[PDB]
Amino acid sequence: SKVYDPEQRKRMITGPQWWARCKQMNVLDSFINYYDSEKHAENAVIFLHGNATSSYLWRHVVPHIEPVARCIIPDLIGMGKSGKSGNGSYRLLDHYKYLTAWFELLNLPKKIIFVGHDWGAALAFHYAYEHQDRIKAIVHMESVVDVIESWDEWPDIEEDIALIKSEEGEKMVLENNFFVETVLPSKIMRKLEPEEFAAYLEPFKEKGEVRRPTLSWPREIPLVKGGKPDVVQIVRNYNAYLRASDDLPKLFIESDPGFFSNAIVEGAKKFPNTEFVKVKGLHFLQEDAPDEMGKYIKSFVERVLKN
């Protein structure tokens, strides 16, 4: 960059710059690429991206939080610079298998903090449900909070999911990279620098099966009518648990104007002990308000740990 460039270019962290700061660890039959701030390891804040993205999504958020707790940020299996799944499956429970095996190797404390976006939040919530004594706090945003029914902003959701579950949906993703090349830039308000978009494109630059995780994620959607039954049960279970979790501090980060935020905020409001903040964004809000997000999370984590 040069001094005369826009601020977003002067602040840019490229893919190679981010990847050089990551570590790799063998996990089961594969490996996970991840960022680990290491210091302040008495707590661990695990940041989980969702569809289309990777640990790179959090690169401008994490600097704010590192000074108060160890921050650990994986590329989910099949995504970013992580290895692939050994049986070629990329369902929620495949991701959960690798995530939990990875946790066992990280020297974590008994109670951890999650920061989840999109399907990353679903992984956090399911982990919490299954390990209710291992959760200190949860931050969530644009998240899978509950089972899903057609609603006012999206009246034909069943039909759109039918499309994504069809062969034409498969073409849209595996052939045309729909989620990375179309949806991702559309749901960030700002312009990504070429190198920033390149970091998201890189894992999925080739046509075909390498793009499978970006097709598999939306096919997991917990629709009340048509949802995968294992995911529907997982979400029903963790939703009931979260509604009753009076002693579990939560932070919900709403995007303004948002994508899923307006439809899911009422769902998020059903969880007790939730602090609510709002930042600029559509779906990938980390790209539109990373500093505000990082500061709100830092403050929340500090107060959770003090109280």
From Swiss-Prot:
Q: Keywords, A to Z?
A: Decarboxylase, Luminescence, Lyase, Monooxygenase, Oxidoreductase, Photoprotein
Identify which top EC class this enzyme belongs to.
Answer: oxidoreductase
Write out the residues that bind substrate. Answer: 160, 283
State the signal peptide span. none
Q: What are the protein's GO molecular function terms?
A: carboxy-lyase activity; Renilla-luciferin 2-monooxygenase activity
Any Pfam family matching the protein: Abhydrolase_1
Give the record's pH note: Optimum pH is 7.4.
- SUPFAM superfamilies noted in UniProt: alpha/beta-Hydrolases (SSF53474)
Q: What does this protein do?
A: Upon binding the substrate, the enzyme catalyzes an oxygenation, producing a very short-lived hydroperoxide that cyclizes into a dioxetanone structure, which collapses, releasing a CO(2) molecule. The spontaneous breakdown of the dioxetanone releases the energy (about 50 kcal/mole) that is necessary to generate the excited state of the coelenteramide product, which is the singlet form of the monoanion. In vivo the product undergoes the process of nonradiative energy transfer to an accessory protein, a green fluorescent protein (GFP), which results in green bioluminescence.
Q: What else is known?
A: This luciferase produces light with a wavelength of 480 nm. In presence of a green fluorescence protein (GFP) it produces a green fluorescence at 509 nm.
Q: What is this protein called?
A: Coelenterazine h 2-monooxygenase
